[PDB]
Design a binder for this molecule. Structure first.
Ligand SMILES: N=C(N)c1ccc(O)c(/C=N\CC/N=C/c2cc(C(=N)N)ccc2O)c1
Ligand SMILES: [Ca+2]
Length: 223
């Protein structure tokens, strides 16, 4: 997260860190046994880490649980990142508490202008690299569809939306992939892609979660 702020320990209880020997992507807890992330974050041997703040220090509220199954969206296209969403089932149910909580799925899509909370352990530098260790946060509005498609001609699909600031300075970045975009208490987006980080007229692109609620619900209920 570039141009953001330190969230504060466990202030985003649904935020998870996917670990394969190191933090590599974010994710969102949707219920005690399931996490939603980006399909481009797929890999074997994933351990889901909940109740995390500083990812390099055991602070007392963590829960490390191995993934038992991963399900990349049936229509995921790695070249265009269309349908960049995947579900991860935990080998054992997470113990829900004030620091480890699920985030509700949307029942309808969000509108342009709506303010959302984006979080993650990604790079905090617009030019260069610096990884935080503690969770970073960023308030950003959903941009107009036209603004989004104008910034990324021919690349934006109905399953994507942009959020952030066209002036630049605030945006998600490498390492935030798979993380949550929450608006009005609903998980409306997943950190998917962008061009550089916090660059002018290059807002972040997010997976439009409201388009996948039926698939998410049906998939979890059948697995
Ligand atoms: N808003 C932006 N310009 C910005 C730019 C790019 C984007 O990545 C994002 C949103 N995604 C972050 C996840 N990155 C980690 C990651 C880790 C791995 C990995 N461990 N192998 C692979 C792909 C990965 O993407 C935002
Ligand atoms: Ca920790």
């Amino acid at each position: 997260i570039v141009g953001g702020y330190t969230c504060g320990a466990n202030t985003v209880p649904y935020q998870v860190s996917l670990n394969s020997g190191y933090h590599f992507c974010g994710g969102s807890l949707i219920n005690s046994q399931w996490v939603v992330s980006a399909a481009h974050c797929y890999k074997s041997g994933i351990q889901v880490r909940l109740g995390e703040d500083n990812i390099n220090v055991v602070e007392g509220n963590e829960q490390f649980i191995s993934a038992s199954k991963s399900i990349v969206h049936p229509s995921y296209n790695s070249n265009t990142l269309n349908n960049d969403i995947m579900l991860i089932k935990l080998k054992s149910a997470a113990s829900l508490n004030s620091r480890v909580a699920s985030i509700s799925l949307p029942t309808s899509c969000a509108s342009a202008g709506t303010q959302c909370l984006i979080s993650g352990w990604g790079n905090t530098k617009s030019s260069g690299t610096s990884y935080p260790d503690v969770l970073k946060c960023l308030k950003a509005p959903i941009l107009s569809d036209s603004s989004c498609k104008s910034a990324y001609p021919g690349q934006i699909t109905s399953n994507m939306f942009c959020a952030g600031y066209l002036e630049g300075g605030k945006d998600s970045c490498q390492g935030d992939s798979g993380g949550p975009v929450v608006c009005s208490g609903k998980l409306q987006g997943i950190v998917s892609w962008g061009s550089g980080c916090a660059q002018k007229n290059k807002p972040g692109v997010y997976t439009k979660v409201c388009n996948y609620v039926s698939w998410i619900k049906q998939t979890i209920a059948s697995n």
